[PDB]
Amino acid sequence: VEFSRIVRDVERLIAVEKYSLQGVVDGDKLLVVGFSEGSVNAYLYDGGETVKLNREPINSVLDPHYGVGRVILVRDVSKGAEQHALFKVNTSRPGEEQRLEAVKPMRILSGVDTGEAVVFTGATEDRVALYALDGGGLRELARLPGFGFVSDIRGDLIAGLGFFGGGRVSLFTSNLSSGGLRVFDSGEGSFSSASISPGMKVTAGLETAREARLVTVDPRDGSVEDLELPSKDFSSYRPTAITWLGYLPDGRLAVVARREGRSAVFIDGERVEAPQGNHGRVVLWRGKLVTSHTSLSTPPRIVSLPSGEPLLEGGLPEDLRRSIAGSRLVWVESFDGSRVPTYVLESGRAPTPGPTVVLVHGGPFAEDSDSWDTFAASLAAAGFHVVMPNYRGSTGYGEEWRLKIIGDPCGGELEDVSAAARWARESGLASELYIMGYSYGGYMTLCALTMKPGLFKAGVAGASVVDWEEMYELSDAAFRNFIEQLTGGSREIMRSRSPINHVDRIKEPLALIHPQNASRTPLKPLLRLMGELLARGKTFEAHIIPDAGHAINTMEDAVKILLPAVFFLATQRE
Amino acid sequence: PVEFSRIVRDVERLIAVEKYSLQGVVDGDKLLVVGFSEGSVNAYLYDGGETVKLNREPINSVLDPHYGVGRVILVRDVSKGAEQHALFKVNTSRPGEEQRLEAVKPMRILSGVDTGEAVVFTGATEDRVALYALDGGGLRELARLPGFGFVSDIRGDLIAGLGFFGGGRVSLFTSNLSSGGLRVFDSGEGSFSSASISPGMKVTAGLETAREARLVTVDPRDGSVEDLELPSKDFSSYRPTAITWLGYLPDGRLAVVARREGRSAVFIDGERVEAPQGNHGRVVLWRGKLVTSHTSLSTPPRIVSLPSGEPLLEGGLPEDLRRSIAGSRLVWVESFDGSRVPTYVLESGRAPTPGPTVVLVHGGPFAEDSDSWDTFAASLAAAGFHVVMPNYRGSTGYGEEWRLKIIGDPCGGELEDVSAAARWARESGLASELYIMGYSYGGYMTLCALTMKPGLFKAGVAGASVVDWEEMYELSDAAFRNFIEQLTGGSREIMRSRSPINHVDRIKEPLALIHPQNASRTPLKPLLRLMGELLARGKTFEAHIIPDAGHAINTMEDAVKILLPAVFFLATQRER
């Protein structure tokens, strides 16, 4: 088909600037970070115009207290390095950077700038520690028992989140003046967000096996109670996650919470009209609410609420814009009676019924939400509708649903994926069906083509697992433990659920995209698969790529990993 | 930053450009052309400024028609690129309706002629190469051939052809439609090159000797050979080194296309006929005028009238792509033993001088880089690489002696010629950095260069490559087993010692492997073993295996998939 058009469109989708809202600084300017093709810059936004604060690209910026007249840039000390330096920029003098020399190179994990002290967590060779940098120099407030993140500061009280053991995220506090550490264990749940009330309590999002709650943790005694808000929109929403929360300067509590792959914005419990998708932090700016917004049809952008009008968004050309046309959540009926929550991104370049890709997510412990995805957008741009099923094993729909995969790889979850394909069929969406996925999704491609021949017209398997038994034996102890958990410790399940053992059954074209030198997705087992495919007469395409990396950031990453899947599907279509 | 979308747009347009091959004259004076158009290889009748498509699904070729026959025999791969072909008849009055010739099971069809009453062809199966005759009554094996063999011409009961029956030498052969059998004629002077049966039932053949070519008359009844005297001396004074094609026209005149230094000339009964600079194919008589094909490094294959040179059918390139070729030249590179390697150089209008340069190594090995259109070289020129195309020993076009030097010595003197062309590029001031790329025997040469000459090139692209002579032999059809024997001088030691899979530890440069999965000449299995070795020995590489495709690419999509990875790879290396 139209190869150069697909490439031009992929270039634009890769290059589109994506924005996140960091806070309000200086006198009522938005601090926003923009990401374009693996390059991060920080900006002041003030009504139409953006002004870049940093010189060379950065990693991130620390969280500013409302109105502070400076920004703290976090920047990799080397190309790719996992160690950082801190640089201050005065908001009145953008582009002029002052290296914070008192802070040696370390892995900067998080931070908040009070305007009087930069309070941050960092990992060195020796430790993870909470630090404060002020006029007198650098102080270590506390050593932390593992990775921790500062969430908020009000006066001398510091609140944060810690991966301090037990499998879940604890809350912690420290004191700006005297340091120390107080940890508040999350019990059956896991803390997701925290902000300090004007009354010096820690409001926190506490995610659980089912619904998330908003709790008040008293830092004087560790008492935890459900926090009741003046408006009951938030509690009647029944969130499963709490993304972020924060007190606004007027003392009202802003909460962003999620359920079923989309978020909602609340101010003192009252829900605010917001564009469908997912949202980030909320600020009050010139007396109006502002957030970031993303969806399957919309790259991360800054919007005004309640209108949803974009204040800052990357440009896509009209033609590409119209190709990526609208997302929706459908509950697909599987075999169990179970209902598989499935996102659908419609293509403006495909008729209905049209060519449809079931794009299976990796993990498996991950979620397909209504959030911008370069892969789904590229497929839509190339004239495919995209179906993204949260097969059992997925996160975002409670622990019971995630746990269903355990013991049963290439079982119920493959039935869920197949259920989503039949639904695409059964609803009038799909004229023809393809499967594509990476990581566990690549494994699902192979499982589909082996266990459900005739379901899909062709399949793309990226960074797939081909044989659990071999993998278990090749692997490091972390990955070995996962394989042991997934398979229920049965060598018999390792074998029967391994697609290399069922190559005879494949009847459809298969494209393999695979890293040449990735430690946890090794090439040898894939060479075996290809040998098995060739021996048994099967149509296959293969692309073996050195240094594939682990995110599609640049056009080069896309050309290596995404383009071959798209060109392969486009040629299989016609 | 690599200009990916610009590269794809250029590569797609250069692939897409229509290309034509002249095949004969059928029915009511209609030209029979094979054309790449609408993204695939098809067969067409041309007459009265219009084409009519004969086939439905894409094809590979057609059999040579006798003049005025009322059908065309399509040759189509029915094995998704593995080159097991079937034959399909189309009546010229009913284009687009195909009758499969079911009496011929799929096999590798090598050549053929359709008299209108007998379809005569050569084909290779697992156990033999054979000359076949097919009629309304059935299929006959006229003779088994001791190697690759090709039907050249039929007049009456007499069949003439050419055979690779030993030592890289080409023999003439005859058979009889009525009675079959095989007579082989070998020259002690060189190799026969094309053949056509005179009205007097002699076989006129090109004879390529050590350093020149000439025309001879072979009497098939007693095997006598004499020089053919022509009524014009232009041919003889032209001093050709190779014969491209010859054929008797219906009016009895003898058309000869002969060449030297990678450009051809057209002669009718010895007389030189004005033709566009480049290379020409077959000459046909159409409505009393001469028509041939024409190509050059800047000119995709087209069909032209002689002596005007005016095209009847041609594809056009847009100005931007036309300017991306700044020029071409033949240079003579001095090799390791003093031999002068005739080397075509395609200068990019998009590269500085000195600039990034690709040594693009031809396949075969019995093939040549000439002043003839090369899609791959044009794509490289468009992506900002100069292209150096060396006629390493084993190449055609420069005499039997140069061609036969390769026999028994793969990855020997011919690799030194490739390496000397590379050195010349750098030493002459053309090349700022050097890459190697090739397909088939050319991909063998990439692998041989990176194993035997580490550090000469910055990076290599090996497409459809020979990896291991030994395993390829075991997997080869009767024809290819024989050919492999000839190339290796029958030595299993040469088979091992000259296979790059046995020298993977020596590789120091980045390598891109490209291979059609159903390639039946250079199979995929040894490539998978090469990948295992590269991995075991900690070498960095990328690989691209193309589905439902083989050696003979006949669609735009498969061409894009075999070419684009190479250009992307080289573009990226250039920024390294």
Ligand code: NA
């Ligand atoms: Na997703």
